Structure formats: structure tokens, C-alpha cells
Amino acid sequence: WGVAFSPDGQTIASASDDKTVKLWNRNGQLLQTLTGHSSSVWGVAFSPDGQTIASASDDKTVKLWNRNGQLLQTLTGHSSSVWGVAFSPDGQTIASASDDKTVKLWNRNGQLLQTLTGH
Amino acid sequence: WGVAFSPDGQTIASASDDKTVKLWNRNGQLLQTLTGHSSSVWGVAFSPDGQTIASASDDKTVKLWNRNGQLLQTLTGHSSSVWGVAFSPDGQTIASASDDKTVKLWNRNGQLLQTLTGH
Amino acid sequence: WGVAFSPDGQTIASASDDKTVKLWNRNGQLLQTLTGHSSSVWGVAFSPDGQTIASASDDKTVKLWNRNGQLLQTLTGHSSSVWGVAFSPDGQTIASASDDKTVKLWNRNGQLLQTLTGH
């Protein structure tokens, strides 16, 4: 996809073609550009409370951000491009999937909890 | 996927192999065939209230329908096949994704609001 | 994906590389290994009540399991590898999708309701 809606529908996150995630309002106004990844961004997600955005990148990281664009964490450990990211329904854990078929589970404080499959 | 459940689980929408979307009840009985696309349908989605269906087609359009099968709107602007379509959680916006890596955001009345990436 | 969170976020199901589904707690600790498929597991899903897990396999079946690891049902009928499985939001139907573009709809007692497309 490369697009995610905030739970309240008021903010939309999109993976851009220039290594950023863009946040937009419902009227299609650009609100914020999230800069930090060092190659293409593939996947985006919002937390269930709507206050954190996750991004998944070809740079082999997942980054966590707030709505003001501040980088909160960089989740490092995948050995290939990360294409997918999702938050758990209670918002406390994050799953990430890389194109080498590895899935990792993290806490939001950035701790790797488990590699569910792969390396 | 090419399948979507209504939020109440009572209607199922499927992209068929014949340029249509089919609507089925929970017992697998056919309710409606949505006819109008001029080539393959790839993606389907329901609105959160369950009363509108969106379809994404190789004909480069997204169409919006009601449950009685009536065509409400055609969203034109993608320059390639549209594979994905999704409503926002509040139902007020619609994102569409084409295989040329373009994502467009529309309002619920079919107004194009923004091209989030691509052309 | 190959991963699904239970609706309450307390159990995580993942397709493993060894023909099993693994269930994990929120801390990443293994709870169960679901053994029975005779080749790779591709897709997993939870019922909306969180009490049943579905798995979709290269062995052309979907298996239904409980959180104690007991196999409850095997859904047979697809003539190719099953990659996707999903429960309806009310939990009364299951859709399965195989890589020959067939989608089947089943009830919760394992009755095939309809082949929505394909064979």
C-alpha cells in the first residue's frame, strides 16, 4: 500500500518517492514531511492512539515518529529491506516484515522482543 | 485479495473474472452484480457504514456503488491500472493506488483532493 | 504478511518456516506450536473473538485451531496452494484465497458456502 490512515481519519501518511513519509490532512494539505531514512520508504502505519507513525524502509530499518515529525526511535536488526510494519491493537508492540521473510516483534520502547520467523 | 467483507459481515464483495464486482450474502447467495467497468476489476472495499462499495479496475478508474448495484461515481485520473482502494476510518476520504506507483486521495463526493505520490 | 495479532493484542500468530504456526504472547514468548500442515504455511488470521486461529498452506488446506493448539477443522477443496485466509467481522464466515485465483467462503462449521470466483 504505502498509505495509512490515522484511526480518526484526520491524518493520512504516505510513503513518498524521495525517502520520506508525508503526512496530509483530510483536505489533501501537506502537514509534515518525516525525514531520516536513507533509502526508499515502502510501508507506513499509525498506532491505534493515533500519536505514533511507523515507517518501513529499504534502509533495513523501521522508524517511529510523532505527528510533529520528530523521530522517536530507529528499530535496527533486519538484514534486508523492510516492507511492512503494523502495530498491535493495544499499541504496545510492533511487527515488522522484511523481504528476506523475517518478521520481528518489537516493543515501542525499541526493544526487540522476538524474531517470529527467519533470521 | 479482491474480496472485502462489509463491516457488519453480512455482505461480501468480490472482484469477478468478468469485469464485474459481485455482492453476496453470508450464506454465499448472490445478491447483485455491479456492471460498468470496461476491464478487469482488481480491488474492492466497503465504506465504514457498509453502504458504499468501491472498485479498482484495470480500466484506470475507481467506481463507487450502492448495495442495490447502482453506480454512484466514477473516479478518473489515474494513468494506469488501479489495484487498490480504501476508505478512511471516518469514511470521508478514499485512497486509490495504481500500478505506476501513484496514490490519489479523494473525498467522498469524488473530488480529487491530492496526488500523494506519483502523477 | 504471515503474522496476525489477536484482537486484544495478547496473542500473536505467525507462519513459521517449518510447516507450523507459532503462537506467541505480547512479550514474544512462545506459547504454542500448531502442527499438522504438510507443507509451508503462508497465511494466518484470528477470529474476531480471538478464540480461533486459521492457517492457510501450500498443502491446499486451511486449518482452524484453538489457543491450546488443538486442531478443530481442516477445510479441503482448493486445488492449489492457499495463501490467504480471513474471518468476517462478525466471525460467521471464513474466506480463503488460493494462488489459482479461487476464493472460497465457508461457515464456521466448515460447510463450503460458495466459490466466489475460480474453481
Side-chain angles (χ1 to χ4, degrees), chain A residues 1-118, chain B residues 1-25 27-118, chain C residues 1-25 27-118:
Chain A
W1 262 100
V3 177
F5 292 96
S6 67
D8 70 359
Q10 294 320 286
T11 311
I12 302 111
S14 61
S16 84
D17 268 83
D18 64 356
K19 310 181 291 209
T20 65
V21 172
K22 294 189 183 167
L23 306 183
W24 310 85
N25 73 15
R26 295 192 303 127
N27 287 333
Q29 197 205 293
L30 180 64
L31 300 172
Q32 202 82 10
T33 300
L34 309 185
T35 300
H37 279 290
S38 56
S39 43
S40 295
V41 178
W42 290 138
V44 295
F46 275 84
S47 60
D49 70 4
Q51 305 315 302
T52 306
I53 298 103
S55 53
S57 174
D58 180 68
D59 72 13
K60 309 181 193 215
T61 73
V62 166
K63 285 170 187 287
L64 306 182
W65 316 84
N66 71 19
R67 298 157 59 208
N68 286 341
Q70 294 173 298
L71 178 67
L72 309 170
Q73 303 280 351
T74 300
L75 306 180
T76 297
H78 283 280
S79 42
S80 76
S81 302
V82 191
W83 57 262
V85 62
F87 286 88
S88 60
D90 72 349
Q92 295 317 106
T93 60
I94 297 152
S96 58
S98 55
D99 70 350
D100 67 359
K101 280 201 156 154
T102 295
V103 175
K104 291 177 184 283
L105 184 75
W106 315 79
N107 191 271
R108 48 184 285 276
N109 71 358
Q111 189 163 43
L112 176 66
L113 297 174
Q114 192 54 273
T115 296
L116 304 186
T117 183
Chain B
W1 260 102
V3 178
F5 291 101
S6 69
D8 70 1
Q10 296 321 293
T11 312
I12 302 111
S14 63
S16 82
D17 222 3
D18 63 359
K19 309 183 290 209
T20 65
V21 171
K22 292 188 185 166
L23 306 183
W24 313 84
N25 74 15
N27 288 335
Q29 298 170 297
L30 180 65
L31 302 169
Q32 307 296 349
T33 299
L34 307 186
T35 297
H37 281 291
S38 57
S39 179
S40 297
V41 178
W42 291 141
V44 295
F46 278 92
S47 60
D49 70 4
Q51 304 317 294
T52 304
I53 299 102
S55 55
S57 174
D58 182 63
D59 73 7
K60 309 181 191 216
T61 72
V62 165
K63 286 170 188 289
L64 306 183
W65 316 79
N66 66 28
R67 295 161 57 206
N68 286 340
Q70 295 174 301
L71 176 67
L72 309 170
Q73 315 193 4
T74 300
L75 308 182
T76 296
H78 283 282
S79 41
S80 202
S81 303
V82 190
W83 56 264
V85 62
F87 289 84
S88 61
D90 71 345
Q92 295 318 105
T93 61
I94 297 158
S96 60
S98 55
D99 71 352
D100 69 356
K101 283 190 50 151
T102 296
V103 175
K104 293 177 182 283
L105 186 74
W106 316 78
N107 76 15
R108 196 54 191 280
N109 285 353
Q111 188 157 156
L112 177 67
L113 295 175
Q114 190 54 274
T115 296
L116 306 187
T117 184
Chain C
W1 260 99
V3 178
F5 290 100
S6 67
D8 69 3
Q10 297 319 287
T11 313
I12 300 111
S14 64
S16 85
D17 57 5
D18 64 355
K19 309 181 290 209
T20 65
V21 171
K22 292 188 184 165
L23 306 183
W24 311 86
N25 74 14
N27 289 332
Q29 296 171 296
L30 179 66
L31 301 169
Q32 307 296 351
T33 299
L34 304 185
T35 298
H37 280 293
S38 59
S39 43
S40 297
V41 179
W42 293 139
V44 295
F46 276 93
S47 62
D49 69 7
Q51 304 316 302
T52 303
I53 300 102
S55 55
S57 172
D58 180 66
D59 71 9
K60 310 181 192 215
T61 72
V62 166
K63 287 172 187 288
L64 304 183
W65 316 81
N66 67 22
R67 296 160 57 205
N68 283 341
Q70 293 176 292
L71 175 66
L72 307 170
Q73 313 191 13
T74 300
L75 308 180
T76 298
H78 283 279
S79 44
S80 76
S81 161
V82 192
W83 57 265
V85 62
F87 288 85
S88 60
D90 64 0
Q92 292 175 56
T93 60
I94 295 156
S96 60
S98 56
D99 71 349
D100 66 356
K101 279 206 330 161
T102 296
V103 174
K104 292 177 183 284
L105 186 73
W106 318 77
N107 76 12
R108 285 301 290 280
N109 288 350
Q111 189 160 327
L112 173 68
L113 295 175
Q114 190 55 273
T115 295
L116 304 186
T117 182

